[PDB]
Amino acid sequence: DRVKKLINSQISLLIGKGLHEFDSLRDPEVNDFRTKMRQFCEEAAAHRQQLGWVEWLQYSFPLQLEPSARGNRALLVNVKFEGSEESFTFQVSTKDMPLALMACALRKKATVFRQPLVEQPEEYALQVNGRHEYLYGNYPLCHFQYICSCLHSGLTPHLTMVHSSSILAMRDEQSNPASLWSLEQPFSIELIEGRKVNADERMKLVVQAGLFHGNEMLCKTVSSSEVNVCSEPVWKQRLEFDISVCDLPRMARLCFALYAVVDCPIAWANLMLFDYKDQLKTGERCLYMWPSVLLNPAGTVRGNPNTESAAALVIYLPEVAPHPVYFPALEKILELGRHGERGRITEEEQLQLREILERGELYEHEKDLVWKMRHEVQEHFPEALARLLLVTKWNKHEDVAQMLYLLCSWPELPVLSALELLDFSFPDCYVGSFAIKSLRKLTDDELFQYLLQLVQVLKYESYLDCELTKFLLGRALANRKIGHFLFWHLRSEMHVPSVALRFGLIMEAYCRGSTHHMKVLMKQGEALSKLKALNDFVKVSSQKTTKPQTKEMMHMCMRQETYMEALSHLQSPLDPSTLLEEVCVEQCTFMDSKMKPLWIMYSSEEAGSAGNVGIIFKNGDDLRQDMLTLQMIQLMDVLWKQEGLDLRMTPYGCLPTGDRTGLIEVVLHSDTIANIQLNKSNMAATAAFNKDALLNWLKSKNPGEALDRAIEEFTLSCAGYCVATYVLGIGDRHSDNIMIRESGQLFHIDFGHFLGNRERVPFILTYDFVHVIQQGKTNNSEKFERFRGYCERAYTILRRHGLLFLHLFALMRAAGLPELSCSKDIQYLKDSLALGKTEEEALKHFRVKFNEALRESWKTKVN
Numbered sequence: 096d097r098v099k100k101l102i103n104s105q106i107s108l109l110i111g112k113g114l115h116e117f118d119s120l121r122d123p124e125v126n127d128f129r130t131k132m133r134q135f136c137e138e139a140a141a142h143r144q145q146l147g148w149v150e151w152l153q154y155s156f157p158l159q160l161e162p163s164a165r166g167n168r169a170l171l172v173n174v175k176f177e178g179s180e181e182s183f184t185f186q187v188s189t190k191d192m193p194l195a196l197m198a199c200a201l202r203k204k205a206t207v208f209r210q211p212l213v214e215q216p217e218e219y220a221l222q223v224n225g226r227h228e229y230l231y232g233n234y235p236l237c238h239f240q241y242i243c244s245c246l247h248s249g250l251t252p253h254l255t256m257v258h259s260s261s262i263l264a265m266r267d268e269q270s271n272p273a274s275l276w277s278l279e280q281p282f283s284i285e286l287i288e289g290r291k292v293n294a295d296e297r298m299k300l301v302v303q304a305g306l307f308h309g310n311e312m313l314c315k316t317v318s319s320s321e322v323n324v325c326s327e328p329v330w331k332q333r334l335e336f337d338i339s340v341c342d343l344p345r346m347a348r349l350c351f352a353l354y355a356v357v358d359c360p361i362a363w364a365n366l367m368l369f370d371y372k373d374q375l376k377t378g379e380r381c382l383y384m385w386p387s388v389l390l391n392p393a394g395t396v397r398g399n400p401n402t403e404s405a406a407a408l409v410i411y412l413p414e415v416a417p418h419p420v421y422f423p424a425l426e427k428i429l430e431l432g433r434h435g436e437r438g439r440i441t442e443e444e445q446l447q448l449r450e451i452l453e454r455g456e457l458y459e460h461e462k463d464l465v466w467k468m469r470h471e472v473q474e475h476f477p478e479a480l481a482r483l484l485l486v487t488k489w490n491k492h493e494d495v496a497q498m499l500y501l502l503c504s505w506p507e508l509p510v511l512s513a514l515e516l517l518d519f520s521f522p523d524c525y526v527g528s529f530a531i532k533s534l535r536k537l538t539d540d541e542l543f544q545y546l547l548q549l550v551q552v553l554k555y556e557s558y559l560d561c562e563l564t565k566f567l568l569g570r571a572l573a574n575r576k577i578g579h580f581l582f583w584h585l586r587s588e589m590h591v592p593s594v595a596l597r598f599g600l601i602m603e604a605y606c607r608g609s610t611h612h613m614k615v616l617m618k619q620g621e622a623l624s625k626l627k628a629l630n631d632f633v634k635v636s637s638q639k640t641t642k643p644q645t646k647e648m649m650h651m652c653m654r655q656e657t658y659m660e661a662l663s664h665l666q667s668p669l670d671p672s673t674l675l676e677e678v679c680v681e682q683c684t685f686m687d688s689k690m691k692p693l694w695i696m697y698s699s700e701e702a703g704s705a706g707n708v709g710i711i712f713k714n715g716d717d718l719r720q721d722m723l724t725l726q727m728i729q730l731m732d733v734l735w736k737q738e739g740l741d742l743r744m745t746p747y748g749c750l751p752t753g754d755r756t757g758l759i760e761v762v763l764h765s766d767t768i769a770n771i772q773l774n775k776s777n778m779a780a781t782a783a784f785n786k787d788a789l790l791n792w793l794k795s796k797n798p799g800e801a802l803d804r805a806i807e808e809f810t811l812s813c814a815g816y817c818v819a820t821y822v823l824g825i826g827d828r829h830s831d832n833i834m835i836r837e838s839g840q841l842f843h844i845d846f847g848h849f850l851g852n853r854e855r856v857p858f859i860l861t862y863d864f865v866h867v868i869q870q871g872k873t874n875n876s877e878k879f880e881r882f883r884g885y886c887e888r889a890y891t892i893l894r895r896h897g898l899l900f901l902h903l904f905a906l907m908r909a910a911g912l913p914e915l916s917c918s919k920d921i922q923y924l925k926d927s928l929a930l931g932k933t934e935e936e937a938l939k940h941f942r943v944k945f946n947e948a949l950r951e952s953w954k955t956k957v958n
């Protein structure tokens with residue numbers, strides 16, 4: 096009642112769109128989605144409210160494990176009990192399970208409190224101090240990201256013994272409140288007129304139209320007559336396509352493009368021929384067009400919401416029957432496709448078929464063999480499904496039904512095959528559903544790794560109520576970390592009108608399933624809102640006065656009650672495990688770059704040294720490419736680690752949150768190469784030669800025996816970053832966008848240009864880094880060639896996963912990133928990974944590239 100109303104207003108402020116606007120559309124598809132998804136999400140909320148206490152830890156604090164541990168040494172740990180002022184430090188082994196550490200902690204408590212305890216270690220979980228992170232399960236301590244991280248930095252793990260009753264009180268606190276195949280006539284539409292058309296009066300107006308099944312044409316494109324340029328052009332002409340109404344596939348889309356001719360692009364618009372209830376569309380349609388930047392089949396199938404300014408093409412869909420006509424039900428489809436001729440071929444053609452199914456464009460005769468032998472593709476080459484789907488004639492209902500019959504008894508495919516099938520090249524809904532079925536086996540860790548791409552896929556969907564939305568919602572409601580990033584990936588695109596309805600509707604549905612998480616995300620939004628206002632202040636102030644003056648005023652503004660309250664005690668949007676507790680106003684500042692990004696520091700007494708975390712708030716730039724590049728660098732690190740190779744990478748968080756707005760994770764104890772190379776006097780790193788500065792800095796940060804492992808960290812990370820930047824074509828690399836951690840770890844920042852952006856980016860070897868790798872010596876081939884080996888190993892591991900990078904980048908094309916919009920961009924990846932060559936041919940080629948980069952480094956070594 097009063098709560099229903101509050102939650103509704105809270106969801107509205109959270110998603111950045113009033114719920115009343117969904118009702119105002121009076122759209123039955125929108126109303127059905129809201130009803131269906133609200134129900135689906137409320138069932139997940141009820142399922143969760145009754146979860147066991149370990150299951151509720153699996154939901155809220157999913158395990159953060161080392162990639163090499165998915166599916167021996169002395170260790171010092173500090174353990175306290177919940178709300179106890181006293182802790183206990185004790186030696187454990189890296190091979191010990193959390194349970195042994197717990198039994199240890201419980202025996203200590205029994206002896207200090209002089210009483211034999213009722214408690215068993217099974218009734219407890221271990222929280223990482225001041226973090227929404229927990230250690231539980233039968234995994235050795237070294238398998239946990241937190242422990243493993245503490246071991247490299249030499250830090251002592253700090254853990255809190257949390258009872259099951261405490262966890263069950265968290266679960267209770269966070270509770271939700273109380274017949275077409277008959278119609279043989281050619282496809283046709285009436286092109287009535289246009290409205291609000293703005294163009295050069297010297298020219299004429301033409302409407303190009305085409306029927307598509309994804310990006311493939313179903314027939315040849317057709318064009319209207321040339322009508323004189325005016326605000327309201329009138330055609331009233333029938334456009335006739337070469338394709339029977341019975342041949343129209345379920346996912347057929349009618350695409351329009353309006354242009355001015357003497358070409359000159361003005362606008363475009365698409366629509367689905369069948370609705371969400373499978374009915375073949377009849378009557379008049381007003382298409383509110385999107386301004387063009389020749390047809391756009393990949394474009395959205397919903398009209399431009401800016402009705403007041405947008406051009407509108409009025410069309411008529413004919414009543415080809417006196418009663419409604421729905422697309423045949425699956426039972427009628429299987430009944431038609433059931434009957435086929437099983438292909439029988441020679442042993443010679445059997446080797447030729449094997450050759451092409453294991454080989455990727457084909458010749459016509461090669462496509463006919465695949466289609467002839469489709470039954471054998473199902474039985475002996477099921478991973479060749481995508482190649483089979485590409486030869487299927489989508490403009491012939493008899494061929495489509497035969498394809499669908501084989502697909503409905505097709506064995507589930509590996510995750511890598513299923514990711515390829517979500518591409519827009521496979522637009523059929525049954526293929527789409529099959530691809531989601533083979534993706535249900537994804538682990539939460541795999542799903543997390545590919546979520547950004549699966550959210551981009553939502554922009555290729557033709558209808559709101561889809562298998563991918565239910566799958567993303569179900570997985571979001573089952574894992575709080577998936578939930579968090581699903582929300583932010585959707586929320587960050589609400590300023591984009593083509594997606595605002597889809598995205599707003601999914602977030603509302605999500606909020607229905609988690610009232611508590613909605614309130615938690617609102618706290619995140621309240622902090623971001625304040626940051627925007629604070630950053631606006633800084634942008635204006637930085638142009639009018641000195642930096643000490645702007646920094647002081649920034650501080651006074653932060654010191655206001657409203658600011659101190661909104662900016663404190665929130666989960667980080669960059670990582671929900673990270674708690675941003677007390678903002679340290681004195682340690683906050685801003686950068687000197689164009690957008691004057693804010694540098695916000697936090698502290699947490701409960702987390703200790705681990706609670707000292709920073710975020711960078713940046714407003715003015717599109718942060719989506721930075722996020723993608725960094726996610727690709729993190730994926731590389733995961734693949735390398737799975738082959739036992741740790742190149743000591745720094746894939747720091749980067750998250751868009753709003754319109755040209757986002758956060759970047761601060762890596763503390765790091766400085767740019769440019770700052771270190773300044774070679775300021777009265778510093779511990781002051782050098783005799785500028786080439787010594789970076790090694791002297793490493794020396795002051797790592798005294799005595801520590802220097803040796805810092806040079807190794809630098810070498811390892813340098814090899815990984817040399818490989819990452821080359822493979823991804825990261826260019827415009829200089830001293831101010833390369834950083835170094837005190838540990839020796841090198842890392843890259845500011846990924847605004849990738850995939851060659853257009854020039855093939857050569858491999859880069861910088862003399863200042865070769866100097867450190869060589870331990871400051873002129874000649875140190877032992878050290879240098881050990882670095883080349885790290886580079887080669889890293890490169891050949893990525894190649895073996897080349898299809899994964901290709902599949903994920905192809906899915907990203909949906910995002911609309913200016914540097915990832917066609918085949919030219921994916922070609923850079925195919926080239927840089929040398930995927931068309933053998934491992935020997937590719938490795939030899941990488942060596943030609945690495946050697947060319949060494950001779951280039953020698954042009955600076957000569958001086």
Ligand SMILES: COCCS(=O)(=O)Nc1cc(-c2cc3c(c(OC[C@H]4CN(C5COC5)CCO4)c2)COC3)cnc1OC
Pocket residue numbers: 684686688689692694711713721747759760761762763765766767770834844845846
């Ligand atoms: C278009 O200009 C690109 C640069 S930007 O700043 O505008 N934006 C940006 C910043 C960062 C990034 C990330 C990290 C760090 C970092 O350091 C920059 C300073 C910070 N300095 C301390 C002294 O007070 C602040 C020390 C010297 O380096 C920067 C450190 O850990 C992670 C990444 N990407 C960016 O954009 C996409």
